[PDB]
Amino acid sequence: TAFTPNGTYLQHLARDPTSGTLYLGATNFLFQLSPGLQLEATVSTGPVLDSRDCLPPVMPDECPQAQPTNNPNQLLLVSPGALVVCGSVHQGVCEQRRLGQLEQLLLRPERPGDTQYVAANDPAVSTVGLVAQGLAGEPLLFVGRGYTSIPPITTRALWPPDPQAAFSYEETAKLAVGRLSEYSHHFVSAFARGASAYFLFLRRDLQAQSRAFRAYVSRVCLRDQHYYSYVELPLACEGGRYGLIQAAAVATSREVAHGEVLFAAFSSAGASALCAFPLDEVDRLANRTRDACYTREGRAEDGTEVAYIEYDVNSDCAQLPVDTLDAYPCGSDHTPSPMASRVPLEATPILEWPGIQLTAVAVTMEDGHTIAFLGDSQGQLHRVYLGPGSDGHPYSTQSIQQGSAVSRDLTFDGTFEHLYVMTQSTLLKVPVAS
């Protein structure tokens, strides 16, 4: 019913849907847990000798400033053929390990090049990722990486013909962004739907006179592997009055595996809000943005500006034929890129909690009703009924670890009878009812 490793901190949680096995990324530790929260394997991951001025492998002659450094886990994703682990040490290099046999190593390049620094090398920065596959069945890895001290989003080979080139990205398989410390992405999550991959994050809206941080959803084709179809849309949760997106989830349940509505928690720069964003409207507005920037020079039919090129790339919206939309739905070498909407996507809060910083969101369905499991910075887990007639107030609240923020990696078990809830010191298997 609990897992509390004495003397270390938790960072990430992954669940193998085939197996039920849980995987924990911790400071200097990887644990494999059975669904019953029973320990099945441990793997030490640090400390090591490191500096952030230094490139792996770290050696005393080239890096005398090296020092004992802990290894907070930075990414932890289940792949078709392996478990993907990236730490925050050694420039965020990754490895792959056997599913169910966490202790044995499958793949790990012996001399990683500067194209294979995957995760964030600063534990105070986040890394988000998403496994997907190529048109040829190749397995790929989408990675969002916040600014530290490397492109903010990349598509990398998980099992390429040479194993040493693993986790590398091709020259066009990244989002080229210039003033990375000024934009200063903070990633929240990444998810797939249909033919697309999506990234939720925070960055500075340099288009705005105040240059304040702003939440965005962002979309790319899965086959593409080129970022030609990259398009960002700002989020407006009460017009952006709750500006800092913290966590989101799509409904997951025995009836609907993955829902069509994104439930996101936002925080004010204090109070929090829950805001729904229908995914067809998300796709509607990115479609408009792409369509306008391709064929009407970034403008609506009445001439109002609706789309532009972000990230200072030397690209422009154009006057391409309407046929380009059908001939190049995921873009091309010379279509305008990367694109953004001037028009936000709006949501009216379905909750407003005046003294709460939400940090985690899970949503499920019970006999047709939508329930939301919402964690906060204080280590509380709330339960809220989201259907018609709702109070907005939680019908239930439970302390997981006082003072210690609940982790985004809320996950249900295969039957949805339990929620796996995590703080910096403990992981619970919490029943959904009684």
């Binding site: 829902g259 069509e260 729904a276 009216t348 379905i350 259907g387």
Partner: peptide
């Protein structure tokens, strides 16, 4: 007013 989630469909009801 505030949106709610429609029972069974998960579709969002914008006004109650």
């Amino acid at each position: 007013x505030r949106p709610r989630v429609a029972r069974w469909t998960g579709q969002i009801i914008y006004c109650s």
